């Protein structure tokens, strides 16, 4: 039925649009961190400590917007 | 020998040309424009102090 059909290009533009937002988000996250690290490596522990904090919540949304993906495309109740 | 003389020190002091990092808080230009009147300031009371 078209029904799979729309949900399986519903699924993979879920996927797709997800990261264009996480991946320039840990992009630049990670560039000012490096470049705040050749300022002061004396603080690499909280420096990880925030930076995985922040990378953590990016992953947060992208893997969302991956599992929903797939709740698509797996077992899902329209289909 | 014996009197009363002054000598000079020609003394040349050595500089750490930059900081690792050197960030800066405000721009190039605007630092220049605040530094520039302290070295004036400087040279005056030295001017005045040779002097006197």
Do not use: C, H
């Not at chain 1, 990880?48 to 919540?57: D, H, I, K, Q």
């Not at chain 2, 900081?19 to 530094?35: G, H, K, R, T, V």
Request: hydrophobic share 50%; net charge negative.
């Amino acid at each position: 039925p078209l029904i799979a059909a729309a949900s399986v290009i519903a699924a993979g533009l879920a996927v797709g649009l997800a990261s264009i937002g996480p991946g320039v988000g840990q992009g630049t996250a990670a560039g000012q961190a490096v470049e705040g690290i050749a300022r002061q490596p004396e603080a690499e522990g909280k420096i990880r400590g925030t930076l995985l904090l922040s990378l953590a919540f990016m992953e947060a949304l992208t893997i969302y917007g991956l599992v929903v993906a797939l709740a698509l495309l797996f077992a899902n109740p329209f289909v | 020998e014996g009197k009363l003389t002054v000598e000079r020190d020609m003394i040349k002091t050595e500089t750490p040309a930059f900081s690792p990092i050197l960030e800066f808080e405000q721009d190039p230009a605007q630092i220049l424009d605040a530094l520039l009147p302290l070295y004036l300031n400087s040279q005056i009371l030295r001017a005045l102090q040779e002097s006197l």
